[PDB]
Structures are given as structure tokens and as C-alpha cells.
Amino acid sequence: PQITLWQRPLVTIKIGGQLKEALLDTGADDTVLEEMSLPGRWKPKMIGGIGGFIKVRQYDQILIEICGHKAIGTVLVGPTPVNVIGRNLMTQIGMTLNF
Amino acid sequence: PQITLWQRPLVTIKIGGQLKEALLDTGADDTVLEEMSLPGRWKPKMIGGIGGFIKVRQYDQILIEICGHKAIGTVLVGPTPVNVIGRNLMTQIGMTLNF
Numbered sequence: 504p505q506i507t508l509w510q511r512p513l514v515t516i517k518i519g520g521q522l523k524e525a526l527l528d529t530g531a532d533d534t535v536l537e538e539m540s541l542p543g544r545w546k547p548k549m550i551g552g553i554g555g556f557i558k559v560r561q562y563d564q565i566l567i568e569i570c571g572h573k574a575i576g577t578v579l580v581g582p583t584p585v586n587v588i589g590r591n592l593m594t595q596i597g598m599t600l601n602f
Numbered sequence: 603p604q605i606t607l608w609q610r611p612l613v614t615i616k617i618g619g620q621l622k623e624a625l626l627d628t629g630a631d632d633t634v635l636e637e638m639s640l641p642g643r644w645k646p647k648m649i650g651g652i653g654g655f656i657k658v659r660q661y662d663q664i665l666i667e668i669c670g671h672k673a674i675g676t677v678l679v680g681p682t683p684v685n686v687i688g689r690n691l692m693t694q695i696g697m698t699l700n701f
């Protein structure tokens with residue numbers, strides 16, 4: 504389907520048994536979510552955007568479910584003010600920008 | 603045209619008669635550009651990014667061409683890692699997310 508940009512493109516994802524609302528963000532290289540517990544090992548990382556950098560924990564090979572599609576990708580967990588689904592995951596569901 | 607998300611959706615924009623590279627950002631409500639000169643008066647605006655809030659200069663009804671398409675709207679100037687084209691301008695050029 505087609506998703507208009509008149510409003511923030513929000514979606515609900517399924518990750519680690521939890522349901523979280525997130526923003527389909529083409530400007531985000533990776534998916535970034537607010538603090539939560541995830542299984543597996545992680546690496547510390549610093550990501551920057553408007554307002555500066557925040558420290559996050561990088562988890563790779565995490566199973567996520569969006570709109571019925573089951574995809575695997577990297578999830579950065581940290582003090583982000585808003586949950587965003589990055590390009591890392593959007594490519595997996597075949598999402599593109601069109602005009 | 604269709605833009606996949608394997609790489610950053612960087613495009614060429616024209617503003618003030620100059621060509622610049624900008625990122626198509628669906629997670630951004632507004633368009634935020636790196637320091638540059640724009641005509642007329644500006645108003646203050648407080649925007650919150652991943653790293654916190656910053657003060658930017660708001661210029662309205664500015665002509666800006668994105669991927670060859672003519673737009674006339676609000677452009678915010680301030681400290682940002684890269685020129686960001688937000689939903690305010692993407693809607694003007696008929697851009698949408700598809701999958």
C-alpha cells in the first residue's frame with residue numbers, strides 16, 4: 504500500500520514480545536528504540552542527529568514484525584525521544600520513497 | 603521515480619540558485635538546512651532532535667527545488683549533521699512511502 508506524508512508515518516512493531524509504536528524514518532540509518540530489554544550481546548555506540556549525540560546499545564540479528572512481515576535487523580536501544588524504524592529494517596520489507 | 607533505501611536517500615536540491623545535497627527524511631516534520639544565507643526576515647523556532655532541543659532560524663515561503671520539483675515553503679536553518687528535507691516539503695512534491 505501507499506503511505507501519505509501529511510502526518511507522521513507511524514506503525515506498530517512486534518519485538519521481544521513487546522508491541523511498540525514507531526516512526527517509519529528514511530532519515531534513520533538504523534532502528535532506534537527507547538530503553539528495553541533485548542536478548543543477546545551488544546556493543547556500545549554513539550549516534551548523532553539534531554541536538555547532538557546519544558549513547559545506545561547495539562543489538563544485531565533481532566527479529567521484528569511489521570504489517571505481517573517478519574524481518575531481521577539491528578536495533579539500537581537508548582534514550583531516544585521517539586522510536587524510529589530505520590532504513591536497516593525498511594529495506595527488508597521492500598519499502599521505498601516514490602514521487 | 604522510485605528511491606530504494608539501501609543507501610541514504612540523498613538528493614540534489616536547489617535553493618538561492620545553488621545546488622546542495624540533502625537527505626529525504628520521513629522522520630522529520632520540518633526541513634532543516636546547514637548554515638546559509640536566505641532573504642527576508644526570520645522567526646525563532648525550537649525543535650527537538652534525537653540529542654535534544656536546539657534553536658533554529660525559520661524562513662517562510664522560500665523557493666526550494668527538490669529532485670527537479672518546485673516547492674515554496676518553510677525552511678529552518680541551524681546546526682544539523684546534514685541538510686534534511688522533512689515532510690513539509692516532501693508533501694509539496696507528492697512524495698510517499700510505498701511497499
Ligand SMILES: COc1ccc(S(=O)(=O)N(CC(C)C)C[C@@H](O)[C@H](Cc2ccccc2)NC(=O)O[C@H]2CO[C@H]3OCC[C@H]32)cc1
Nearest residue numbers: 530531532533550551552553585629630631632650651652
Ligand atoms: C545510526 O542510526 C540513527 C538513527 C536515527 C538518527 S536521528 O533520529 O537523529 N535522525 C537522523 C537525521 C537527524 C539525519 C532521524 C531524523 O528523522 C529525526 C528522528 C527524530 C528524533 C527525535 C524526535 C523526532 C524525530 N528527526 C528529526 O530530528 O526531526 C527534526 C526535524 O523536524 C522535526 O520533526 C520532529 C523532530 C524534528 C541518527 C542515527
